[PDB]
Design a protein around this ligand. Structure first.
Ligand SMILES: *[C@@H]1O[C@H](CO)[C@@H](O[C@@H]2O[C@H](CO)[C@@H](O)[C@H](O)[C@H]2NC(C)=O)[C@H](O)[C@H]1NC(C)=O
Ligand SMILES: *[C@@H]1O[C@H](CO)[C@@H](O[C@@H]2O[C@H](CO)[C@@H](O)[C@H](O)[C@H]2NC(C)=O)[C@H](O)[C@H]1NC(C)=O
Ligand SMILES: *C1O[C@H](CO)[C@@H](O)[C@H](O)[C@H]1NC(C)=O
Ligand SMILES: *[C@@H]1O[C@H](CO)[C@@H](O)[C@H](O)[C@H]1NC(C)=O
Ligand SMILES: *[C@@H]1O[C@H](CO)[C@@H](O)[C@H](O)[C@H]1NC(C)=O
Ligand SMILES: *[C@@H]1O[C@H](CO)[C@@H](O)[C@H](O)[C@H]1NC(C)=O
Ligand SMILES: *[C@@H]1O[C@H](CO)[C@@H](O)[C@H](O)[C@H]1NC(C)=O
Ligand SMILES: *[C@@H]1O[C@H](CO)[C@@H](O)[C@H](O)[C@H]1NC(C)=O
Ligand SMILES: *[C@@H]1O[C@H](CO)[C@@H](O)[C@H](O)[C@H]1NC(C)=O
Ligand SMILES: *[C@@H]1O[C@H](CO)[C@@H](O)[C@H](O)[C@H]1NC(C)=O
Ligand SMILES: *[C@@H]1O[C@H](CO)[C@@H](O)[C@H](O)[C@H]1NC(C)=O
Ligand SMILES: *[C@@H]1O[C@H](CO)[C@@H](O)[C@H](O)[C@H]1NC(C)=O
Ligand SMILES: *[C@@H]1O[C@H](CO)[C@@H](O)[C@H](O)[C@H]1NC(C)=O
Lengths: 4, 728, 731, 6
């Protein structure tokens, strides 16, 4: 999940 | 009003948002943390008593990070020596307190460096994972039974997930599933033997003379994946003198033909478990339903009972196939799937019957099934007022599907348009949490007649504080592109004057199934930027965005870095024709997928944006992991989707960064989007002669979330945006 | 009105608009040299100045490969062609090699030198070949004959025969080669390195974007106090090689006085056909022993008589400028000349007999001998800074061996105004020398016969560049001293054109300040400072304070055991003194450096002095425990409680992070820096983050200590120019 | 030698  | 909301306000947390976090221990009672005490509350009356006194452990010696109390209520688990790993994973030390006796248990202890612990769903049994193996304790003070003997660090994972499964599939470290009454322990086993490793440097404290190399099995796009096995063990017949028998359930014939994933584990009954499997090409999934055979001692999944879920136009599920919610007898279930029109709604299945029947319909989507009884199914959706960014709790009468009641729509329609819910053990009571557009509101209701019992937290302490601050407002609306609505939100500076020209910052994420336009109240960087710097902060959900049906969401299938990029630029073109925007001062920023899209926008040569910041950006899709990437992109091979992998890199756009001011930021110990991704952007900008700004954060990961690093990055970005906008 | 309106711009520096012409020759005899002219190799008669084509550029067009470099055999019969060049460290690289018979005009295709060869070298006479491949030594007596394998123990990253490891390459030998042929090629001497338990520095290498997973580079690299490589030394007779028996390497052991602890092999110098001298250094680098070893006829062995041992040590610091000096033996090899520091801390030429402990100084004074350049039977040729008592000048002198009072300067008066910094290249028996003048005017190359020290001709006068600079507003250099603590300390200033001392200029302190450094000299440069003065009207200044070289041990040894102190403190005071000269804007003083220069820049900016507004650190050292053992322990000792831990722990950049709140800071480092590791920069950045200071950063993906690739070099200077201009409020 | 190569 490319998500902070 | 004269004070503004400052960067310090955001960073130091001046104005706090009060929660009301509970855990239902029964149908009638829940646990709360008062003023460092653990209180027990009665749902009916709202009276409380101290369940566990604050000072009970002031001679423990260790700082207690969390508590977990057994379902029967006889024992409590104390978690300490917390060490974070990835997003969900961590290790900890554990102690078990005897509530009845009022004493710490000193014998046959849970070892240090335990990877995962869970009570059985009823009673007081324990399963834990330690050095990648599963152990079970029937009684908290008795010896543990070793279930698995194959666990090997970085290679064989029993009852815990590996990097990709943790992040992309289960969103959890745990891979242990207790049966409803604790008889059976179901578990997955992951094998990472030929999964290549990502390696990077860890510098540690300055006392460390030589940097360490962190090595993590991490499959990047098209690389060899972890393989998965699935087992069930009987905990009611464990032996002290012989090893435990684990009965394997093998994936369906339809999955065993190539690479695949285990994607869901849901217990139906005491003797029935559902498993969903997904092919590596993520447009075909299969639900197996498996029953325990008392005479065999085994588990059989009938081919007649399989349920296929697939997609012609995309991948299956929002991020994965949805979970089933079985009726009490386990002979039927409810599950969110996209209908004929590509909208995600609740389908009712029969265990034996291939065809399901839709029980909800329309041009809106069910977000989640929250609770199921004999009489009602409870669900969250964005139906109210056709606003895909609003959230309300509905209940559908099971004996007649046309009787749908909205349980949150009308409670406080002005301040409350975004709700989630927490029901008691048997859905007798539910707490509603409203997250905006007003300050968050926490309320308790009874399911019987859906009456409001009481307000739990109204955030009035915050409300009084905010009175004297010049706060920004939020506009949520839609624009029309090619006869379709696309929603945007704007954080507007105080005393917003339409006659003025304000600088605009485009806050982008824009990943598949994303939603950045919504009714949620937030205090964040954008709050400071609007309040103190008088910048408008905007977000837009274009093609690829979620909760609006497949035609929008699947628009980017196999084609990341195209439509979702173009729609951000088009939205900015639209915002600049709104009159109150200074065309000379338009910026864009984003984190991770947002970092990718930002970079792609700035390398487009569109002329719209003066500057932008990409934080921890993806730079090309082969660098990112297999299960996320391949879901949307397929494989990076000539026979599949290689040309678009090659064509959707930020490096390919380097030359167009001459037209813009760029800040590139990345954590050096990012296990998720590897520092490699930025290192390739910077190299390519250098190779074409573009000047840009950079910041690496030593030893920070994807979150860049240390107190000091967090403050440092936002301070650095604020200076950058202020310089871009000519703001003193 | 034909007035000079051009300046030397940033594009001029980066696109090399103004090119310094060189004249790089290779002596092949005592009368002839080789020189390249439009890629053709020409042979030159030094005496008459006539040339002819030694090798047409078109000899290897039909080769199928692109030639990196060449080597002609001492006997002019063969040429060695180097291609598939792949750089490793500062000196190491691998390459493919082909040999071309000059007498048959045909590439040798039988028994070729293998690919991935690490080093190749002709014997000093004839055309024997020695090469290292896979960490093992090999000899070819003739170029088309099979090789003789000398060593069988070589193993990547563990055992090195005839080549150095990382530290030896960089800090000890300043070369990849660890092979020394005897003067007539009878003997092949070599060192063997063992890195078995040397720890590895590990870092990511990202490569081309097609590389899916980054590569981890692992290099045996001993940080301060860590376990070091061990060394053995052997001599082999190549004249008694055989196809049927393995070669016998005769080990020469270190003196007993070295074998007691950790030590180094610091010098190998052949004295005669049968006499080799070795210098050895203890890990505490204040004691060295020179062994002189003779071949025993009937044994086939090498024996080093204790009577011929020579001890060199120091009470005030380390031995030699960076290592013990090399000896220069007289023809009979019974005597030698060497640079050592005299009773008063000045480095002069001492004359030793092989059998005698005491030496006699042949030069003296409050100046120093830089190097011994050549020795004949009547004269010794040397470079020193004696002239006009200017430590930053360099001239070639000759001294009569039979009369030490007969000392002549050969360069001083050639061109007094234009030339004060000389180096020299002598022919095989010193019959001719090329002089190279490096400044203060344009570089100038001239040829001379040593018989009566007459000029033959100008080889290169840079008149093409002189022509170009006619209407360019170039800066000047002011070279002078200040008298701190009644001691002379030299500085230079790169001063903007039409310099007005009534005006106030911004000032950049360009710093290095390492031990034995010299940043104030008479050398002419076309660099970044040139642009900053010429175009941006910034004064660029440099200062040699305590610890600086070429002015005696009392200056140089001042920082012994104490890096990050007086040298850092002297740059600050330098800046203070420059302000009080009255043409410096106090509000606009910056400081910058690279490596040791980045260290001092960072230590200065975290001093709390208030003098500096901003500064740039490029590839800085941040704490000395991160740097290699041989450089660091030379100046700092061991980082242990009973040696020098306190000052190791006291001289980090990290500890001064709070003080960075007062300045603007740019931190730059290449991710693939194998010398001063990115680690060092990463630790500074984490320290500034931890105290909440904003700074500017720039990593350079896959760049090393030099950040020297064409595009990277352009990007870093471009980037630094922006930072300096903004700090100085320059439009 | 902590000094720029060249
Ligand atoms: C994990 O997966 C690997 C497959 O890569 C299995 O390793 C193979 O096992 C067979 C049978 O022992 C060998 O013949 C192969 O040589 C193995 N390949 C290897 C080690 O790379 C391994 O058995 C699996 N382990 C478990 C516990 O499931
Ligand atoms: C290189 O040095 C290592 C020591 O650092 C040598 O390995 C040792 O070998 C001896 C005898 O075989 C043992 O007593 C030691 O325990 C070994 N040390 C180790 C491995 O730590 C090795 O012999 C040397 N190699 C050569 C060819 O010189
Ligand atoms: C990018 O896109 C085109 C198809 O339009 C394809 O031919 C090309 O090979 C792709 N990748 C590269 C390496 O440029
Ligand atoms: C609330 O009151 C009821 C009255 O019977 C009691 O059972 C219960 O203990 C109370 N709950 C508390 C104090 O949390
Ligand atoms: C866990 O760690 C502590 C500290 O090392 C130790 O004293 C304790 O006995 C360990 N093991 C168990 C069984 O908790
Ligand atoms: C069971 O587990 C392992 C087999 O891998 C073995 O080492 C262990 O001793 C076994 N115990 C018994 C008693 O079966
Ligand atoms: C839990 O389920 C198992 C398996 O169906 C059953 O044998 C057991 O009796 C159940 N537990 C109780 C308390 O009835
Ligand atoms: C799954 O995706 C592939 C593209 O690789 C496509 O050819 C195939 O039609 C899809 N399968 C289904 C059932 O839609
Ligand atoms: C220079 O001239 C002499 C003849 O006067 C000749 O012998 C020699 O070969 C020449 N050198 C060259 C052209 O290399
Ligand atoms: C060196 O490499 C090239 C290219 O693979 C090959 O043609 C040649 O034969 C190799 N070997 C030697 C000994 O030169
Ligand atoms: C030469 O030495 C090596 C290593 O000791 C050995 O393998 C080889 O057989 C030797 N050659 C002979 C046969 O003399
Ligand atoms: C080289 O030196 C050795 C040792 O003195 C000697 O025996 C040999 O003859 C010399 N070579 C020639 C041909 O001069
Ligand atoms: C060499 O250094 C040590 C300090 O490390 C010192 O005590 C010793 O006396 C020195 N040796 C000489 C010859 O001065």
């Amino acid at each position: 999940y490319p998500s902070k | 009003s004269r004070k503004t909301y400052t960067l310090t306000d955001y960073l130091k947390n001046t104005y706090r948002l009060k929660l009301y976090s509970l855990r239902w221990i029964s149908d009638h009672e829940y646990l709360y943390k008062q003023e460092n005490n653990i209180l027990v509350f009665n749902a009916e009356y709202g009276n409380s008593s101290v369940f566990l006194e604050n000072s009970t452990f002031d001679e423990f010696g260790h700082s207690i990070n969390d508590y977990s109390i057994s379902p029967d209520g006889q024992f409590i688990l104390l978690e300490y020596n917390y060490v974070k790993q990835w997003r969900h994973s961590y290790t900890a030390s554990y102690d078990i307190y005897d509530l009845n006796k009022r004493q710490l248990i000193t014998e046959e202890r849970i070892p240090n460096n335990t990877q995962w612990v869970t009570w059985s769903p009823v009673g007081h049994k324990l399963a834990y994972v330690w050095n990648n193996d599963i152990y079970v304790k029937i009684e908290p003070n008795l010896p543990s039974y070793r279930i698995t003997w194959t666990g090997k660090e970085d290679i064989i994972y029993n009852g815990i997930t590996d990097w990709v499964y943790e992040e992309e599939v289960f969103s959890a470290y745990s891979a242990l599933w207790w049966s409803p009454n604790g008889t059976f322990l179901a578990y997955a086993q992951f094998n990472d033997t030929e999964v290549p490793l990502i390696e990077y440097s860890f510098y540690s404290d300055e006392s460390l003379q030589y940097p360490k190399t962190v090595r993590v099995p991490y499959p990047k796009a098209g690389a060899v994946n972890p393989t998965v096995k699935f087992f069930v063990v009987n905990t009611d017949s464990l032996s002290s003198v012989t090893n435990a028998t684990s009965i394997q359930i093998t994936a369906p014939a339809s999955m065993l033909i190539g690479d695949h994933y285990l994607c869901d584990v849901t217990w139906a009954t005491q003797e029935r478990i559902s498993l969903q499997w997904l092919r590596r090409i993520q447009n075909y999934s299969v639900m197996d339903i498996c029953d325990y055979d008392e005479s065999s001692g085994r588990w059989n999944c009938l081919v007649a009972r399989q349920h296929i879920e697939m997609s012609t136009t995309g991948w299956v599920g929002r991020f994965r196939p949805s979970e089933p919610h079985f009726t009490l007898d386990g002979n039927s279930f409810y599950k969110i799937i996209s209908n004929e029109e590509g909208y995600r709604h609740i389908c009712y299945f029969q265990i034996d019957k291939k065809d399901c029947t839709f029980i909800t319909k329309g041009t809106w989507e069910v977000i989640g099934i929250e609770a199921l009884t004999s009489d009602y199914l409870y669900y969250i959706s964005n139906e109210y007022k056709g606003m895909p960014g609003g959230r309300n709790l509905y209940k559908i009468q099971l004996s007649d599907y046309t009787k749908v009641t909205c349980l949150s729509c009308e409670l406080n329609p002005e301040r409350c348009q975004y709700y989630s819910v927490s029901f008691s053990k048997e859905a007798k009571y539910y707490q509603l949490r409203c997250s905006g557009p007003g300050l968050p509101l926490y309320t308790l209701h009874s399911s019987v007649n859906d009456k409001g019992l009481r307000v739990l937290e109204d955030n009035s302490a915050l409300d009084k504080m905010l009175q004297n601050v010049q706060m920004p407002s939020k506009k949520l609306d839609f624009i029309i592109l090619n006869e379709t609505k696309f929603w945007y939100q704007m954080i507007l500076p105080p005393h917003f004057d339409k006659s003025k020209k304000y600088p605009l910052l485009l806050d982008v994420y824009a990943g598949p199934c994303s939603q950045k336009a919504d009714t949620v109240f937030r205090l964040n960087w954008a709050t400071y930027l609007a309040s103190t710097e008088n910048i408008i902060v905007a977000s837009f959900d274009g093609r690829g965005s979620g909760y609006q049906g497949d035609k929008i969401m699947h628009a980017i299938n196999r084609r990341l870095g195209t439509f979702e990029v173009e729609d951000q630029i088009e939205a900015a073109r639209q915002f600049s024709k709104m009159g109150f925007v200074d065309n000379k001062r338009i910026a864009i920023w984003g984190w991770s997928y947002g970092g990718y899209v930002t970079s792609m926008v700035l390398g487009s040569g569109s002329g719209v944006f003066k500057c932008g910041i990409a934080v921890a950006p993806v730079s090309r899709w082969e660098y990112y992991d297999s299960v996320y990437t391949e879901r949307y992109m397929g494989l990076p091979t000539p026979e599949d989707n290689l040309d678009h992998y090659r064509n959707s890199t930020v490096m390919s756009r380097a030359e167009n960064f001459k037209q813009v001011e760029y800040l590139l930021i990345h954590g050096t110990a990012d296990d998720n989007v590897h520092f490699q991704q930025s290192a390739q952007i910077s190299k390519a900008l250098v190779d074409v002669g573009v000047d840009f700004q950079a910041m690496w954060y030593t030893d920070e990961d994807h979150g860049i979330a240390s107190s000091t690093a967090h403050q440092h990055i936002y301070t650095h970005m604020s200076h950058f945006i202020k310089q871009c906008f000519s703001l003193p």
